[PDB]
Write a protein that binds this ligand. Structure first.
Ligand code: BES
Ligand code: BES
Ligand code: BES
Ligand code: MG
Ligand code: MG
Ligand code: MG
Ligand code: ZN
Ligand code: ZN
Ligand code: ZN
Lengths: 518, 518, 510
């Protein structure tokens, strides 16, 4: 725990973090649809679709244990409504005990397997029914087919979208009550019950990352972010070490140190370790890019579209890695040891900053000619990757908001994965499938390597000719892993939900599924 | 108090000239019905010809000299016309056989001169004074002017004639000599006589603001500007207090303090007070934006057209308020108490600067999400407005070089006024009329308020979607006045005289007439 | 048809060379086992060292004592194998004849990539361009695939050939020494064919927009079909109107050249087991239209290359027509036009109707290729084929995603994408599969028309364009190959002729 330096006494000295959220107070009950649905207080929503028939009629198929509600939901009455994806309706009636009940449905369209994107749309509709309605309970009845992973994703997403982050509200808090109870009716319920607590853990790891990402750069700087990581390790009983500048100089981490030279906050390198109590069969290092604010440095983000105002989000890789630490430390997988690493710093303009053209020496002794101070993420990752390989692990996976070009290549929905090992890339792609966080495999094109040849240094930080900047970044990172299966996930395009004006906490579940299924 | 320096050659005060050559001019007013004595120096007739576009000159005054009367006969004048701003010089021997210079300035053919027309007249008169070593000027009014326009004539003559040589060293004008006497002949002289020393006061308030504005950012910084304000207050016997960082921290002025974080000069908040002896019937806070240099901060003024080289002028608001303090302190109105306020600081790039995205807390507890460090003026004004309202005043008027959009809406001639109270706005418009500093009322459009809703903080500093930036800045300021009549004068477009390459000292006479009228 | 002219000096046809010096090279391949004969011309060894940039050491026996001396280890040690490094020396052989002997460095890595083999070849071509030689012999002291061997041959031939049509010497023999020489012999004439289809494509692309316009390009395609005995049909503006190709006709509106739609057909002898339509973007000059290419980086000077897909599809027609694969039927389609600024041009905001009835709101007149392809895809689908593959210089964003080396392929059918990926492997023209992300589809929801041509929000423009194209195929396996990044060799200042060998491999394989 280090002291956060301040310029004025009003500067904050820690990131506010909510651990005990209202989602954690929700009691979840799962029931099998074969027993019929009981319809009482709160709101009961049926998820309904109509395979084949685009915008086909709503038909409720579950038995409802109430004659009045059954009459209301009969085919004749329901057929005037359709299943258009995201569409919803509210119903009011008196049940058999003469107590008014609210019921409704959300349309799930006409395609029998919902994509992760479609399910998100269903959930967003559901959340709009929760908002601006003081409810003690929500009950959801599944009349659509979902596998266990998709069921879990539904719950994670519901929890995540429902939770409102009011840490920075003062005079403008939403005068917002949360349900206390969530009932779920589904066929073969016993088989889905295990997903409930798993969803609740994955929600929090995601939401925890999101809290770190949304925290502004005055709150979340390298000192306060490494202090938060210390606190998280203490809560989960993970080992931890925070390396400070004296130890970083001793390790010759010149690339990482150069990036931080301009900051009033000392670099802090985060190292958390989870080890299973049994025989360790796999060792994994997860590396996250940890830039708490990216101004660009002397290559200032001044160009139209450079989005300097969003650059508190440049520690999203680090957040995903810490969200993963939360999930792993909670679920406690066996036979594995996991290292959670981030070379945390801030990229600023100062008499002290590194310069375009500076030649700096990484910890593996490679000299690097700086071509653009705004390509700082790959310099911090270079040193974090050398540290990670020294740990003697089987896999290194880094995750980073590394290149704006991702917005032009995969866009805002899919992350890109690059790597030096196909078995490991396939594992990441499998984790993507079971986490429902989409990733697409992109190539490291060796032909571009030659454009990183420096006239003076051992290597160039950037290409002068190749515009394929995400692949060029990957080529540069590859030079810092000598003999270990490595994969790199570029989340520059996917991390921030531009429409909703908030983080996604992208990568937490992906990396956790990777760890668990190994 | 002590001005920090980087090197010993950095200046530690603003040079300020109080006893200017204008102050040494002996001014006499005579009634025109006694006829004009033409004895020495230069004698200029102000002549028009109503109806006749570019009509002939006809000198109507009685002239007490046969030789000069002969010269000025209609036949001899008929070659010349009254085209606005046109002028001629004549040379002749008078009755005492002493050579004299005589001439005229054409005042056009519209019998009521606008402020801009009158400025054109004065500029032509001034070109006759330049490059001619004269000890005396006499001006004969053969046009119609009310008392306010006569005063405007003199104020404008004084200000345009005065040349600012404080930063000249090897290039002072070896030929500049100023007249020692000004004679004025006008109909109903006795009623105009009162205007002479009022003009001299108003000239000085305006010229003082001008000196402060023109003083570059290495001379005029938060420390030297607040020191100059103390010296002013001492000279006029005003109560004064300068609030330093520790007091500002105690007052929780987090928005103002965040702006000045990246500067080598500590924040200084100026608070001067004039109080009439006797019953105080109106209490007024005048608030001036006082950014001594606006680099833009991490949103650096680097786009083409951003005028970074002009940004020493971003304390023009504060200068108008201090110019006003000079006039009020000199003229001593009854029945009022006036607070002259400025939150002074410099907006710089540093490891210590606030960043885009930072969430800061204003002195009224509202949290603000910073969307652009270059919208700094509204942050400093926010805390200054909160401070003003705590004083328990009847009216709060702020004046500020706030938005570049003023150049596209009103341009360089008229300031914009916005406000929450129609009677206050009308007072300002009234003062605009009698000061001859033009102002136009612009709307605060509440439909745009929703664009300042922040996802995380209570409010956004800037709009995501609305390009009407002067209106959006007024919506933001309005959030920091709770229940007091308030108006905001945006002088961004009018403050600097781009053609003459000098300040106008805009707003000193406006604000003084506002105080005096009330 | 006759090409319109503004002045009598305007060209009325594209000059094409069919018979090239490459066609006069006699090629012979020999087994390395019996040693090499260095009797005449230039001999180059392809040598690696599996020591990084370590020394050259030559292992083949040579049947000349003087040359054998030159090639002794002690001498060869002074040179290194760094990929693409070369040296060659003139000397007198055993019968006092002048010969030149050298090596090209093949690096330290066993499997040579496509890109590495290109480097080897550029270095070889550097020597050929600089020397008056009647014969070249190449000795493979490195291991190559049959396919990579053919690739070596195609690249050699293509790079060596110089295009002099607009300006106002070659070897006559090629000897190749290689292990298991008998297995590589059938690669030789296949390469010569792939060379020419690629070179032809390159000639159309390199041809400036005053020479190559929708009229002269369609005339060239007719002449190709005639030389090859393919069926051909050029659709003119009247038939295009009859067919309601309003998206395509709109793009052509501002141009002095009438739109011409090319449709060539290859049919196999024997039972036709597969039908395929290959559709190429054929914009003969893309100015951007009222959305003019004026922005820094917009490369308006290169936009003669905007018919590269069309050229790939015609080069493929040459290969298919020549090689004559069986059990397959192939349609070669291109909706050719030119995108210009005029009083007659289509405008930003215009609503146009495609041949399948879909109305389209134009957001950008520079997204013209997808409009021409929309009509071409409808046309293609009406043919009842098994696969439709289009190839197009569609989005500048490709430079930012895959870059200049690898094309992107998007599709609606994994089986078909997999076949294209495999054709990529065997052609050695690299392609990477990119996703059609359906979450972006809603951004093409137009307020007024059935669909928007462009997204306002999504910057992933190559995916957006694919989502748009996808709306014009209803029920047929389809893939789209975006070659905007890949088509032009910026550094060498010439086309690559990219896609010809890919599509021919696709046709020959499946
Ligand atoms: C100089 C370039 C090769 C690299 C440069 N990279 C960066 O700026 C990273 O440090 C940025 N964090 C990338 C970024 C930009 C916009 C939105 C999301 C992510 C980029 O522009 O992407
Ligand atoms: C970021 C924007 C919404 C607000 C911004 N405002 C400012 O820069 C003020 O701090 C400027 N001092 C106002 C200004 C700009 C140009 C000329 C004269 C005056 C402006 O660009 O007008
Ligand atoms: C408006 C956009 C969505 C589409 C636009 N597309 C085009 O300009 C195509 O018609 C161009 N022919 C593609 C192109 C541009 C630059 C370099 C190589 C290739 C583009 O610039 O990508
Ligand atoms: Mg950067
Ligand atoms: Mg500013
Ligand atoms: Mg175009
Ligand atoms: Zn970054
Ligand atoms: Zn400012
Ligand atoms: Zn095009």
């Amino acid at each position: 725990a280090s002291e956060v330096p301040q310029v004025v006494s009003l500067d904050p000295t820690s990131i506010p973090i909510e651990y005990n959220t209202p989602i954690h107070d929700i009691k979840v009950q799962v029931y099998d649809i074969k027993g019929g649905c009981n319809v009482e207080e709160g709101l009961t929503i049926f998820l309904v679709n109509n395979p084949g028939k685009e915008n086909g009629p709503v038909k409720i198929s579950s038995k409802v244990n109430d004659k009045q509600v059954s009459e209301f939901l009969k085919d004749e009455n329901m057929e005037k409504f359709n299943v258009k994806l995201g569409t919803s309706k509210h119903f009011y009636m008196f049940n058999d005990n003469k107590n008014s009940v609210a019921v409704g449905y959300v349309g799930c369209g006409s395609v029998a397997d919902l994509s992760e994107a479609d399910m998100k749309r269903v959930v967003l509709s559901l959340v709009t029914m929760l908002h601006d309605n003081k409810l003690s309970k929500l009950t959801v009845v599944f009349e659509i087919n979902v596998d266990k992973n998709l069921f879990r994703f539904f719950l994670e997403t519901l929890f995540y979208e429902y939770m409102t982050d009011e840490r920075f509200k003062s005079t403008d808090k939403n005068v917002m009550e949360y349900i206390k109870h969530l009932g779920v009716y589904i066929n073969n319920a016993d088989t889905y019950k295990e997903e409930v607590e798993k969803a609740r853990v994955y929600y929090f790891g995601t939401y925890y990352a999101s809290q770190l990402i949304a925290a502004p750069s005055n709150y979340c700087n390298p000192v306060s972010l490494s202090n938060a990581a210390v606190e998280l390790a203490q809560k989960l009983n993970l080992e931890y070490k925070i390396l400070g500048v004296k130890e970083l100089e001793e390790l010759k981490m010149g690339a990482y140190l150069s990036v931080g030279k301009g900051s009033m906050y000392p670099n802090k390198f985060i190292h958390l370790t989870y080890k299973s109590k049994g025989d360790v069969k796999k060792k994994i290092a997860l590396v996250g890019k940890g830039i708490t604010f990216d101004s660009g440095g002397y290559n200032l983000k001044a160009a139209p579209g450079s989005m300097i105002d969003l650059m508190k989000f440049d520690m999203s890789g680090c957040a995903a890695v810490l969200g993963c630490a939360y999930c792993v430390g909670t679920l406690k997988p066996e036979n594995v040891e996991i290292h959670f690493l981030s070379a945390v710093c801030e990229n600023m303009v100062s008499k002290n900053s590194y310069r375009p053209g500076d030649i700096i020496t990484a910890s593996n002794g490679k000299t690097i000619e700086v071509g653009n101070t705004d390509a700082e993420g790959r310099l911090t990752l270079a040193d974090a990757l050398v540290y990670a390989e020294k740990l003697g692990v089987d896999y290194i996976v880094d995750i980073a908001t590394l290149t704006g070009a991702m917005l032009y290549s995969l866009g805002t929905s899919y992350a890109g994965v690059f790597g030096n090992n196909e078995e490991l890339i396939n594992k990441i792609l499998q984790s993507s499938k079971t986490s429902n966080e989409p990733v697409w495999w992109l190539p490291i094109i060796n032909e571009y390597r030659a454009t990183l040849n420096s006239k003076y240094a051992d290597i160039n930080q950037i290409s002068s000719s190749v515009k394929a900047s995400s692949i060029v970044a990957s080529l540069f990172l590859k030079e810092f892993v000598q003999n270990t299966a490595w994969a790199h996930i570029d989340i520059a395009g996917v991390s921030w939900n531009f429409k909703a004006r908030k983080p996604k906490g992208f990568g937490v579940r992906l990396l956790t599924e990777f760890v668990l299924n190994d």
